Structure 1
Amino acid sequence: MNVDLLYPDPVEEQRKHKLKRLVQGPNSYFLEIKCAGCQDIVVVYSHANTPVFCPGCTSQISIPTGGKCAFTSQVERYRQ
């Protein structure tokens, strides 16, 4: 079976540790979210540590959990 360490295979890399990969890279992303009422775009980390409130609505659009940040309003996928 042909598997080569020098040229790293991207499919396995995702399952691998953020540090164990041939290059220790970020494993999280910035996601803009769509407030249903207004079209202001708020960028949020894939894992949020501090709450970001949608501009014009005082209530935080993201209540942080240990990893993924859920959103009270509908979610804009990643960057789209």
Structure 2
Amino acid sequence: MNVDLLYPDPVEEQRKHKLKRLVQGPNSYFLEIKCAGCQDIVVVYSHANTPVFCPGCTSQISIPTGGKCAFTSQVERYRQ
């Protein structure tokens, strides 16, 4: 272990605060949901703090959360 700040282990940067990284940037990402008529990608904000609606439907796909937004239907990981 003679790791120096120039090259920090990826997990270290992923563990620390997104401003206290040697390279600062977005903690959040885009995570898919599944909807009626869709086996394809339906990307949404991972940390949505606002209502997203079923494409062409009245019901809201993502529940509002201070953190990553939760969902009530089938969902797909990150980007696929």
- Asked whether the equivalents of residues 51 and 61 of structure 1 are also in contact (C-alpha less than 8 Å), the reply is yes
TM-score, normalised via structure 2 length = 0.84
How far 1:77 sits from its partner (Å)?
A: 1.4
8 A Cα contact 1:28 1:47, kept in partner: yes
User: Cα offset for 1:37?
Assistant: 5.0
Aligned length: 80
Between the aligned residues of both structures, percent identity stands at 100
Quote the offset at 1:54 in angstroms. Answer: 1.4
Q: Deviations over 1:18-67 (max 9, x none)?
A: 00000111000011211155446432112112111111321100121111
* Alpha-carbon separation, structure 2, partners of 1:55 and 1:31: 16
- Spell out the pairing of 1:1-80 with structure 2 (5 A cutoff): 1-39=1-39, 41-80=41-80
Q: 1:71 to 1:37 in 2, by over 3 A?
A: farther
What is the distance in 1 between the residues matched to 2:44 and 2:70?
A: 10
For structure 1, the 5+ residue unaligned runs are none
Change in 2 beyond 3 A, CA 1:74/1:36: farther
Q: CA RMSD in A?
A: 1.8
